[PDB]
């Protein structure tokens, strides 16, 4: 059977002395006893009679999608593609699902990395393994979200029962964005907000949905006069947005309305 | 920010032996193919070898066969080129350059090493 | 085996010029194999383009590449003052990387 001679592994049939080489199948597992190497098991991706195969660190054949010289070969089943053999690199185009894990296969027969336009729709194939990103991944400096099948999403999408924003270039779309004549606020890690927060005019409402004044979801409303909110207290004048230091009204009522976050921190009822 | 940073200039005395690093840090090292390029002074760029992080692949250009070995991270995050007996037509310029996993094209490189090798 | 010619050599051209850049191979090749390299004087070699007219990471848009079988081209629409170094083209094939001797590109003055 296969035995250890040097850290290099290698394979004897009972006659003595009679090392085996070529392909033998220990079991479940194929490997290749290079006749060329004094009967050792090839390890990584190694050539047989012109076919490219591909064998772990233990000389065991594998199949699937792996690192080359070249880039990422496709060591396919049999008869995957022209009647190949067991791991064999084939002359594969398209994309690729082994499961889960999407490829899609450049026009030289190496997987694609990066952005890549499939049908109608964006991919992101990672650099490191040639697997379609899914979910929400930062690419660059800017965040997007792809499906469970990888395709880049546009618009709202609900991600751990909070709302992003991925504008028409799937953009992930942060703080204070006019999104079609209408004005929301997403945080810095892109999940919309309601409240008030610091918007480049300055101090700015994103209301709940009311079924009166007909808001949509976390909407910019523009706002005047006192606004209770939260336990907070703030007043809007005719900008729409909130006014900070010392202000009376005409109710009686002075207020000082904080400078940072320009809540109310004081107030006094006169006449 | 992906970067490969190596060790500082060498000056040996011909026939000696030296180990020169590339340390590679912002991204995933097993994930990508590490190179080594020599620039002979005042003259252009000749691919030597790359080696695989992930699966300890290597392969030379024929040029370089047998008089240099690569080899890496010894732990974390590392890539290493040697010779046993320098000439002093081994002066020259040696970068390492991480390789993009498609189409082969180096996408980043390191500062330089400058190895300087005379009687 | 695959051997990169690139013409001219020398290219004196002024700032706000544009710039044609040649390499021509011995042997048809494959565009995805095709890049090109900048690099300034005692400064380490930069990605221009990969898979001959993609653009890698943060290079400007004067930077266009274009070309296939053996003759490929690397063109800068607009010179800027940083644009004047050395410039390589690079292939990969039958398990070797093969370089250009590169063309610098010198200021007219």
């Known amino acids: 059977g296969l035995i250890y001679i040097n850290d290099s592994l290698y394979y004897f049939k009972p006659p003595v002395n009679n090392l085996i080489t070529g392909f033998v199948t220990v079991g479940d597992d194929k490997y290749y006893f290079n006749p060329i190497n004094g009967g050792a098991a090839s390890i990584g991706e190694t050539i047989i009679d012109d076919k490219n195969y591909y064998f772990n660190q233990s000389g065991v054949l594998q199949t699937g999608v792996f690192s080359t010289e070249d880039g990422f070969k496709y060591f396919a089943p049999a008869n995957t593609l022209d009647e190949n053999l067991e791991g064999e690199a084939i002359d594969f185009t398209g994309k690729l699902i082994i499961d889960e894990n999407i490829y899609y296969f450049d026009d030289n027969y190496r997987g694609a990395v990066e952005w890549k336009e499939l049908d109608g729709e964006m991919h992101y194939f990672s650099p490191e393994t040639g697997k379609a990103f899914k979910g929400l991944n930062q690419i660059g400096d800017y965040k997007y979200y792809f499906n469970s099948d990888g395709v880049m999403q546009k618009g709202f999408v609900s991600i751990n029962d909070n709302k992003h924003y991925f504008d028409d270039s799937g953009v992930m779309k942060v703080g204070y964005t006019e999104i079609d004549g209408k004005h929301f606020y997403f945080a810095e890690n892109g999940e919309m907000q309601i409240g008030v927060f610091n918007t480049e005019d300055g101090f700015k409402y994103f209301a709940h949905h009311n079924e009166d004044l007909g808001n949509e979801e976390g909407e910019e409303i523009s706002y005047s006069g006192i606004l209770n909110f939260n336990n907070k207290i703030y007043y809007f004048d005719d900008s729409f947005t909130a006014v900070v230091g010392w202000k009376d009204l005409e109710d009686g009522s002075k207020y000082y309305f904080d400078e940072d976050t320009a809540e109310a921190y004081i107030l006094e009822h006169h006449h | 920010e992906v970067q490969l940073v190596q060790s500082g200039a060498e000056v040996k005395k011909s026939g000696e032996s030296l180990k020169i690093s590339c340390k590679g840090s912002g991204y995933s090292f097993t994930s990508y193919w590490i190179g080594w390029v020599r620039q002979m002074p005042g003259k252009g760029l000749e691919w030597m070898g790359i080696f695989y992080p992930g699966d300890s692949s290597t392969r030379y250009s024929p040029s370089f066969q047998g008089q240099v070995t690569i080899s890496a991270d010894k732990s974390v995050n590392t890539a290493y080129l040697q010779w046993s007996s320098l000439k002093a037509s081994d002066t020259a310029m040696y970068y390492c350059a991480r390789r993009r996993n498609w189409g082969n094209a180096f996408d980043i490189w390191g500062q330089g090493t400058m190895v300087t090798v005379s009687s | 085996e695959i051997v990169l010619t690139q013409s001219p050599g020398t290219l004196s051209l002024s700032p706000g010029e544009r710039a044609t850049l040649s390499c021509r191979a011995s042997?048809?090749?494959?565009?995805?194999?095709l890049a090109w390299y900048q690099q300034k004087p005692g400064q380490a070699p930069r990605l221009l383009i990969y898979?001959?007219?993609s653009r890698a990471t943060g290079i400007p848009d004067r930077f266009s590449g274009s070309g296939s079988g053996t003759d490929f081209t690397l063109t800068i629409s607009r010179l800027e003052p940083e644009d004047f170094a050395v410039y390589y083209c690079?292939?990969?094939?039958?398990?070797?990387?093969?370089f250009g001797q590169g063309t610098k590109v010198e200021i007219k003055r």
């Open positions: 898979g001959a007219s």
């Open positions: 042997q048809s090749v494959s565009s995805s194999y």
């Open positions: 690079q292939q990969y094939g039958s398990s070797t990387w093969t």
